mmCIF file of C-alpha atoms and ligand atoms in Angstrom:
data_model
loop_
_atom_site.group_PDB
_atom_site.id
_atom_site.type_symbol
_atom_site.label_atom_id
_atom_site.label_comp_id
_atom_site.label_asym_id
_atom_site.label_seq_id
_atom_site.Cartn_x
_atom_site.Cartn_y
_atom_site.Cartn_z
ATOM 1 C CA UNK A 1 22.057 18.560 2.658
ATOM 2 C CA UNK A 2 24.492 18.937 5.601
ATOM 3 C CA UNK A 3 21.803 17.113 7.660
ATOM 4 C CA UNK A 4 21.786 13.818 5.666
ATOM 5 C CA UNK A 5 24.361 11.567 4.144
ATOM 6 C CA UNK A 6 23.030 9.994 0.847
ATOM 7 C CA UNK A 7 23.685 6.375 -0.025
ATOM 8 C CA UNK A 8 22.422 4.139 -2.897
ATOM 9 C CA UNK A 9 19.417 4.825 -5.090
ATOM 10 C CA UNK A 10 16.795 2.302 -3.848
ATOM 11 C CA UNK A 11 14.336 2.724 -6.802
ATOM 12 C CA UNK A 12 12.665 5.168 -9.146
ATOM 13 C CA UNK A 13 9.456 5.254 -11.128
ATOM 14 C CA UNK A 14 6.167 7.141 -11.335
ATOM 15 C CA UNK A 15 6.688 8.080 -7.635
ATOM 16 C CA UNK A 16 10.047 9.892 -8.310
ATOM 17 C CA UNK A 17 13.448 8.648 -7.022
ATOM 18 C CA UNK A 18 14.132 7.234 -3.546
ATOM 19 C CA UNK A 19 17.646 7.015 -2.017
ATOM 20 C CA UNK A 20 18.925 5.315 1.141
ATOM 21 C CA UNK A 21 20.375 7.832 3.602
ATOM 22 C CA UNK A 22 21.430 8.498 7.184
ATOM 23 C CA UNK A 23 20.491 11.352 9.406
ATOM 24 C CA UNK A 24 23.905 12.735 10.355
ATOM 25 C CA UNK A 25 23.053 13.882 13.930
ATOM 26 C CA UNK A 26 22.096 10.453 15.300
ATOM 27 C CA UNK A 27 22.833 7.989 12.493
ATOM 28 C CA UNK A 28 19.076 7.254 12.030
ATOM 29 C CA UNK A 29 18.507 5.328 8.753
ATOM 30 C CA UNK A 30 16.233 7.291 6.439
ATOM 31 C CA UNK A 31 14.860 7.243 2.935
ATOM 32 C CA UNK A 32 15.215 10.335 0.841
ATOM 33 C CA UNK A 33 12.459 10.770 -1.759
ATOM 34 C CA UNK A 34 12.609 13.363 -4.601
ATOM 35 C CA UNK A 35 9.379 14.435 -6.362
ATOM 36 C CA UNK A 36 9.572 16.738 -9.411
ATOM 37 C CA UNK A 37 7.239 19.785 -9.075
ATOM 38 C CA UNK A 38 5.992 19.592 -12.628
ATOM 39 C CA UNK A 39 4.948 15.968 -11.994
ATOM 40 C CA UNK A 40 2.724 16.700 -8.967
ATOM 41 C CA UNK A 41 -0.998 16.826 -9.884
ATOM 42 C CA UNK A 42 -2.506 17.772 -6.518
ATOM 43 C CA UNK A 43 -1.387 20.405 -4.149
ATOM 44 C CA UNK A 44 -2.578 21.131 -0.739
ATOM 45 C CA UNK A 45 -1.698 23.712 1.743
ATOM 46 C CA UNK A 46 -0.449 23.670 5.272
ATOM 47 C CA UNK A 47 -2.224 25.483 8.195
ATOM 48 C CA UNK A 48 -0.316 28.699 7.252
ATOM 49 C CA UNK A 49 -0.593 28.523 3.461
ATOM 50 C CA UNK A 50 2.705 27.054 2.304
ATOM 51 C CA UNK A 51 1.770 25.279 -0.898
ATOM 52 C CA UNK A 52 2.954 21.619 -0.818
ATOM 53 C CA UNK A 53 2.342 18.340 -2.656
ATOM 54 C CA UNK A 54 -0.878 16.676 -1.448
ATOM 55 C CA UNK A 55 1.438 13.715 -0.692
ATOM 56 C CA UNK A 56 2.978 15.756 2.133
ATOM 57 C CA UNK A 57 -0.487 16.699 3.575
ATOM 58 C CA UNK A 58 -1.571 13.027 3.503
ATOM 59 C CA UNK A 59 1.674 11.879 5.074
ATOM 60 C CA UNK A 60 1.340 14.424 7.902
ATOM 61 C CA UNK A 61 -2.274 13.257 8.510
ATOM 62 C CA UNK A 62 -1.233 9.577 8.972
ATOM 63 C CA UNK A 63 1.992 10.431 10.746
ATOM 64 C CA UNK A 64 2.293 8.676 14.123
ATOM 65 C CA UNK A 65 4.128 6.107 16.266
ATOM 66 C CA UNK A 66 1.793 3.475 14.705
ATOM 67 C CA UNK A 67 4.254 1.546 12.841
ATOM 68 C CA UNK A 68 1.966 0.112 10.047
ATOM 69 C CA UNK A 69 2.222 3.345 7.992
ATOM 70 C CA UNK A 70 5.550 4.978 6.899
ATOM 71 C CA UNK A 71 6.484 8.029 9.033
ATOM 72 C CA UNK A 72 7.348 11.366 7.271
ATOM 73 C CA UNK A 73 10.205 12.836 9.290
ATOM 74 C CA UNK A 74 10.953 16.090 7.411
ATOM 75 C CA UNK A 75 10.639 17.727 4.018
ATOM 76 C CA UNK A 76 12.372 20.474 2.030
ATOM 77 C CA UNK A 77 11.391 22.531 -1.030
ATOM 78 C CA UNK A 78 13.963 23.014 -3.855
ATOM 79 C CA UNK A 79 13.551 25.084 -7.046
ATOM 80 C CA UNK A 80 12.129 22.205 -9.131
ATOM 81 C CA UNK A 81 11.301 19.481 -6.511
ATOM 82 C CA UNK A 82 10.374 18.600 -2.950
ATOM 83 C CA UNK A 83 12.469 16.253 -0.940
ATOM 84 C CA UNK A 84 10.765 14.038 1.625
ATOM 85 C CA UNK A 85 12.675 12.442 4.505
ATOM 86 C CA UNK A 86 10.995 9.144 5.468
ATOM 87 C CA UNK A 87 11.606 6.373 7.905
ATOM 88 C CA UNK A 88 13.753 3.451 6.759
ATOM 89 C CA UNK A 89 13.630 0.085 8.530
ATOM 90 C CA UNK A 90 16.811 -1.914 8.294
ATOM 91 C CA UNK A 91 17.058 -4.639 6.925
ATOM 92 C CA UNK A 92 13.993 -4.048 4.723
ATOM 93 C CA UNK A 93 12.550 -5.658 1.542
ATOM 94 C CA UNK A 94 9.363 -4.616 -0.314
ATOM 95 C CA UNK A 95 6.662 -7.204 -0.611
ATOM 96 C CA UNK A 96 6.902 -7.314 -4.472
ATOM 97 C CA UNK A 97 10.624 -8.425 -4.118
ATOM 98 C CA UNK A 98 9.810 -10.804 -1.306
ATOM 99 C CA UNK A 99 7.193 -12.493 -3.517
ATOM 100 C CA UNK A 100 9.602 -12.570 -6.437
ATOM 101 C CA UNK A 101 12.028 -14.467 -4.218
ATOM 102 C CA UNK A 102 9.780 -16.763 -2.303
ATOM 103 C CA UNK A 103 6.933 -17.344 -4.845
ATOM 104 C CA UNK A 104 3.342 -17.952 -3.523
ATOM 105 C CA UNK A 105 3.265 -17.506 0.296
ATOM 106 C CA UNK A 106 2.142 -20.127 2.811
ATOM 107 C CA UNK A 107 -1.327 -19.039 4.036
ATOM 108 C CA UNK A 108 -0.174 -18.546 7.641
ATOM 109 C CA UNK A 109 2.317 -16.003 6.325
ATOM 110 C CA UNK A 110 -0.187 -14.341 3.978
ATOM 111 C CA UNK A 111 -2.632 -14.139 6.849
ATOM 112 C CA UNK A 112 -0.172 -12.287 9.086
ATOM 113 C CA UNK A 113 0.872 -9.891 6.309
ATOM 114 C CA UNK A 114 -2.697 -9.301 5.049
ATOM 115 C CA UNK A 115 -3.940 -8.644 8.605
ATOM 116 C CA UNK A 116 -1.248 -6.025 9.107
ATOM 117 C CA UNK A 117 -2.033 -4.338 5.789
ATOM 118 C CA UNK A 118 -5.713 -4.178 6.881
ATOM 119 C CA UNK A 119 -4.767 -2.474 10.241
ATOM 120 C CA UNK A 120 -2.542 -0.016 8.223
ATOM 121 C CA UNK A 121 -5.285 0.862 5.688
ATOM 122 C CA UNK A 122 -7.810 1.267 8.532
ATOM 123 C CA UNK A 123 -5.384 3.710 10.215
ATOM 124 C CA UNK A 124 -5.205 5.722 6.903
ATOM 125 C CA UNK A 125 -9.015 5.887 6.702
ATOM 126 C CA UNK A 126 -9.365 6.850 10.433
ATOM 127 C CA UNK A 127 -6.946 9.696 9.712
ATOM 128 C CA UNK A 128 -9.104 10.956 6.697
ATOM 129 C CA UNK A 129 -6.683 9.583 3.980
ATOM 130 C CA UNK A 130 -7.423 7.254 1.063
ATOM 131 C CA UNK A 131 -4.168 5.703 -0.267
ATOM 132 C CA UNK A 132 -5.445 4.624 -3.825
ATOM 133 C CA UNK A 133 -2.353 2.547 -4.629
ATOM 134 C CA UNK A 134 -2.315 -0.466 -2.294
ATOM 135 C CA UNK A 135 -0.119 -3.154 -3.960
ATOM 136 C CA UNK A 136 2.917 -5.291 -3.094
ATOM 137 C CA UNK A 137 5.372 -2.664 -4.467
ATOM 138 C CA UNK A 138 4.063 -0.158 -1.865
ATOM 139 C CA UNK A 139 4.462 -2.358 1.182
ATOM 140 C CA UNK A 140 7.786 -2.666 3.042
ATOM 141 C CA UNK A 141 8.650 -5.546 5.329
ATOM 142 C CA UNK A 142 10.765 -4.785 8.403
ATOM 143 C CA UNK A 143 12.539 -8.146 8.253
ATOM 144 C CA UNK A 144 13.845 -8.190 11.894
ATOM 145 C CA UNK A 145 10.412 -7.383 13.449
ATOM 146 C CA UNK A 146 8.053 -8.992 10.907
ATOM 147 C CA UNK A 147 6.202 -5.629 10.652
ATOM 148 C CA UNK A 148 4.766 -4.322 7.347
ATOM 149 C CA UNK A 149 4.606 -0.584 6.459
ATOM 150 C CA UNK A 150 2.421 1.001 3.839
ATOM 151 C CA UNK A 151 4.359 3.516 1.744
ATOM 152 C CA UNK A 152 3.968 5.970 -1.224
ATOM 153 C CA UNK A 153 0.997 8.244 -0.759
ATOM 154 C CA UNK A 154 1.731 10.024 -4.039
ATOM 155 C CA UNK A 155 -1.545 8.684 -5.639
ATOM 156 C CA UNK A 156 -3.634 9.317 -2.521
ATOM 157 C CA UNK A 157 -6.519 11.709 -1.739
ATOM 158 C CA UNK A 158 -8.439 13.033 1.218
ATOM 159 C CA UNK A 159 -11.036 10.334 2.110
ATOM 160 C CA UNK A 160 -14.538 11.482 1.158
ATOM 161 C CA UNK A 161 -17.968 9.645 0.992
ATOM 162 C CA UNK A 162 -18.884 10.883 -2.515
ATOM 163 C CA UNK A 163 -17.702 9.491 -5.894
ATOM 164 C CA UNK A 164 -14.155 9.936 -7.164
ATOM 165 C CA UNK A 165 -13.873 10.597 -10.901
ATOM 166 C CA UNK A 166 -10.026 10.764 -11.117
ATOM 167 C CA UNK A 167 -7.447 8.048 -10.503
ATOM 168 C CA UNK A 168 -3.712 7.747 -11.108
ATOM 169 C CA UNK A 169 -2.743 4.612 -9.054
ATOM 170 C CA UNK A 170 -2.045 1.187 -10.620
ATOM 171 C CA UNK A 171 -4.549 0.055 -13.237
ATOM 172 C CA UNK A 172 -4.299 -3.798 -12.605
ATOM 173 C CA UNK A 173 -5.315 -3.145 -8.951
ATOM 174 C CA UNK A 174 -8.179 -0.830 -9.918
ATOM 175 C CA UNK A 175 -11.820 -1.910 -9.786
ATOM 176 C CA UNK A 176 -14.182 -2.665 -12.636
ATOM 177 C CA UNK A 177 -16.296 0.484 -11.995
ATOM 178 C CA UNK A 178 -13.139 2.594 -12.575
ATOM 179 C CA UNK A 179 -12.373 0.648 -15.825
ATOM 180 C CA UNK A 180 -15.962 0.952 -17.138
ATOM 181 C CA UNK A 181 -17.281 4.269 -15.829
ATOM 182 C CA UNK A 182 -14.291 6.202 -14.500
ATOM 183 C CA UNK A 183 -16.164 6.393 -11.137
ATOM 184 C CA UNK A 184 -15.514 4.681 -7.799
ATOM 185 C CA UNK A 185 -16.152 5.157 -4.067
ATOM 186 C CA UNK A 186 -12.963 5.118 -1.972
ATOM 187 C CA UNK A 187 -13.620 2.238 0.454
ATOM 188 C CA UNK A 188 -15.013 -0.313 -1.928
ATOM 189 C CA UNK A 189 -12.213 0.464 -4.459
ATOM 190 C CA UNK A 190 -9.698 -0.027 -1.617
ATOM 191 C CA UNK A 191 -11.223 -3.455 -0.709
ATOM 192 C CA UNK A 192 -11.039 -4.513 -4.387
ATOM 193 C CA UNK A 193 -7.318 -3.670 -4.432
ATOM 194 C CA UNK A 194 -6.951 -5.689 -1.179
ATOM 195 C CA UNK A 195 -8.609 -8.696 -2.968
ATOM 196 C CA UNK A 196 -5.969 -8.321 -5.711
ATOM 197 C CA UNK A 197 -3.205 -8.077 -3.122
ATOM 198 C CA UNK A 198 -4.329 -11.127 -1.187
ATOM 199 C CA UNK A 199 -4.557 -13.231 -4.424
ATOM 200 C CA UNK A 200 -0.996 -11.960 -5.247
ATOM 201 C CA UNK A 201 0.323 -13.167 -1.900
ATOM 202 C CA UNK A 202 -1.232 -16.619 -2.004
ATOM 203 C CA UNK A 203 -0.726 -17.320 -5.724
ATOM 204 C CA UNK A 204 2.599 -15.433 -6.251
ATOM 205 C CA UNK A 205 1.229 -13.009 -8.890
ATOM 206 C CA UNK A 206 -1.836 -10.807 -9.522
ATOM 207 C CA UNK A 207 -5.004 -12.419 -11.040
ATOM 208 C CA UNK A 208 -5.705 -9.847 -13.834
ATOM 209 C CA UNK A 209 -3.431 -8.292 -16.432
ATOM 210 C CA UNK A 210 -6.115 -6.897 -18.844
ATOM 211 C CA UNK A 211 -9.133 -4.637 -18.648
ATOM 212 C CA UNK A 212 -11.290 -7.444 -20.079
ATOM 213 C CA UNK A 213 -10.331 -9.686 -17.119
ATOM 214 C CA UNK A 214 -10.970 -7.016 -14.460
ATOM 215 C CA UNK A 215 -14.411 -6.266 -15.863
ATOM 216 C CA UNK A 216 -15.372 -9.953 -16.114
ATOM 217 C CA UNK A 217 -14.387 -10.552 -12.459
ATOM 218 C CA UNK A 218 -13.979 -14.330 -12.883
ATOM 219 C CA UNK A 219 -11.116 -15.539 -10.552
ATOM 220 C CA UNK A 220 -9.115 -18.745 -11.342
ATOM 221 C CA UNK A 221 -6.634 -20.130 -8.773
ATOM 222 C CA UNK A 222 -3.448 -21.439 -10.281
ATOM 223 C CA UNK A 223 -2.031 -22.618 -6.909
ATOM 224 C CA UNK A 224 -3.564 -24.715 -4.198
ATOM 225 C CA UNK A 225 -5.413 -22.241 -1.923
ATOM 226 C CA UNK A 226 -7.810 -23.125 0.910
ATOM 227 C CA UNK A 227 -11.528 -22.692 0.289
ATOM 228 C CA UNK A 228 -11.783 -20.079 3.088
ATOM 229 C CA UNK A 229 -8.985 -17.957 1.589
ATOM 230 C CA UNK A 230 -10.556 -18.322 -1.918
ATOM 231 C CA UNK A 231 -14.003 -17.261 -0.559
ATOM 232 C CA UNK A 232 -12.514 -14.066 1.009
ATOM 233 C CA UNK A 233 -10.630 -13.130 -2.190
ATOM 234 C CA UNK A 234 -13.753 -13.698 -4.337
ATOM 235 C CA UNK A 235 -15.823 -11.605 -1.845
ATOM 236 C CA UNK A 236 -13.296 -8.638 -2.009
ATOM 237 C CA UNK A 237 -13.460 -9.006 -5.817
ATOM 238 C CA UNK A 238 -17.275 -8.821 -6.045
ATOM 239 C CA UNK A 239 -18.291 -7.032 -9.250
ATOM 240 C CA UNK A 240 -20.879 -4.776 -7.507
ATOM 241 C CA UNK A 241 -19.127 -2.441 -5.116
ATOM 242 C CA UNK A 242 -21.804 -2.714 -2.330
ATOM 243 C CA UNK A 243 -21.423 -6.587 -2.465
ATOM 244 C CA UNK A 244 -17.766 -6.224 -1.172
ATOM 245 C CA UNK A 245 -17.001 -6.728 2.539
ATOM 246 C CA UNK A 246 -16.241 -3.828 4.935
ATOM 247 C CA UNK A 247 -12.923 -3.936 6.756
ATOM 248 C CA UNK A 248 -14.785 -5.321 9.786
ATOM 249 C CA UNK A 249 -16.232 -8.145 7.706
ATOM 250 C CA UNK A 250 -12.801 -9.039 6.236
ATOM 251 C CA UNK A 251 -11.142 -9.131 9.643
ATOM 252 C CA UNK A 252 -14.027 -11.237 11.082
ATOM 253 C CA UNK A 253 -13.861 -13.645 8.147
ATOM 254 C CA UNK A 254 -13.013 -17.281 9.165
ATOM 255 C CA UNK A 255 -9.725 -17.288 7.159
ATOM 256 C CA UNK A 256 -8.445 -14.298 9.256
ATOM 257 C CA UNK A 257 -8.766 -15.908 12.735
ATOM 258 C CA UNK A 258 -5.655 -16.795 14.902
ATOM 259 C CA UNK A 259 -3.199 -14.436 13.194
ATOM 260 C CA UNK A 260 0.442 -14.592 14.236
ATOM 261 C CA UNK A 261 1.991 -11.625 16.063
ATOM 262 C CA UNK A 262 4.512 -9.707 13.834
ATOM 263 C CA UNK A 263 7.515 -10.924 16.014
ATOM 264 C CA UNK A 264 6.315 -14.560 15.771
ATOM 265 C CA UNK A 265 5.903 -14.093 12.014
ATOM 266 C CA UNK A 266 9.581 -12.945 11.726
ATOM 267 C CA UNK A 267 10.804 -15.848 13.916
ATOM 268 C CA UNK A 268 8.815 -18.588 12.016
ATOM 269 C CA UNK A 269 9.023 -17.218 8.455
ATOM 270 C CA UNK A 270 11.712 -14.573 8.054
ATOM 271 C CA UNK A 271 14.547 -16.255 10.078
HETATM 272 N N1 LIG B 301 8.735 -0.222 -4.472
HETATM 273 C C1 LIG B 301 10.062 0.220 -4.004
HETATM 274 C C2 LIG B 301 10.260 0.207 -2.433
HETATM 275 C C3 LIG B 301 11.704 0.591 -1.980
HETATM 276 C C4 LIG B 301 12.074 2.073 -2.422
HETATM 277 N N2 LIG B 301 11.166 3.111 -1.784
HETATM 278 C C5 LIG B 301 11.082 3.395 -0.435
HETATM 279 C C6 LIG B 301 12.045 2.816 0.465
HETATM 280 C C7 LIG B 301 11.960 3.180 1.798
HETATM 281 BR BR1 LIG B 301 13.295 2.270 2.958
HETATM 282 C C8 LIG B 301 11.015 3.990 2.407
HETATM 283 C C9 LIG B 301 10.057 4.506 1.516
HETATM 284 C C10 LIG B 301 8.984 5.451 1.674
HETATM 285 C C11 LIG B 301 8.534 5.594 0.362
HETATM 286 C C12 LIG B 301 7.410 6.332 -0.133
HETATM 287 O O1 LIG B 301 6.597 6.897 0.753
HETATM 288 O O2 LIG B 301 7.193 6.324 -1.384
HETATM 289 O O3 LIG B 301 9.212 4.901 -0.575
HETATM 290 C C13 LIG B 301 10.138 4.257 0.142
HETATM 291 C C14 LIG B 301 11.888 2.104 -3.947
HETATM 292 C C15 LIG B 301 10.515 1.651 -4.519
#
């Protein structure tokens, strides 16, 4: 309020409305995210019983210097909303916009980005948090450093080992067991969404637009993609959840070897 100067609206949607801002005391770039109270489905509580959006609990759980996940810096409660103060890299572009501009990504570039999204998702899971909405719109690229950041935990849940029977993330990234049965386990649903995301990077758009396509699980490549990259995508998109790879198996897959460092990725591909 007196602590932040507000700049342009960066976007709005099912997550609420996000503005660019600056922390007045030190000029730190921030993002200022507004979530309407009557739009929040899950609430948690802090160690002290303040009731808050679950999004705030999940953000505090993943909060750290590890730069692959967005950092929550502060939050405020207002009569009808919460306001979240988040990190803002500068210059930044989300991966959906990057793919709009560049089209299908060279595999070396997809490999570096996909590897970093894997390290980020693993960090979420180590911290007890299941994101449930991994997709290009929820990934920011720090263009100077070549570092990716997972954002928007507003569809997320505490990670558990039993079945989830609710879901409010993005349907075209959701797995066939959710479409058919309204049931999924967190990790294998996450790896399916990562299959979708990797196809999106290397082909320039997602493979499935319809329920019928998700449930059939047949994958057609409309761009030239190496056999190793196609094998990994088709493995992540296995119809049976226990036939999907673990994160360890994805990162040990032959297509993932020799990944660029984030700085090298910015030097070779982003400038
Ligand atoms: N897909 C778009 C990305 C740019 C903008 N959101 C956006 C920009 C910036 Br910088 C940081 C964050 C953190 C979060 C969040 O946790 O939801 O959203 C953010 C609008 C929506």
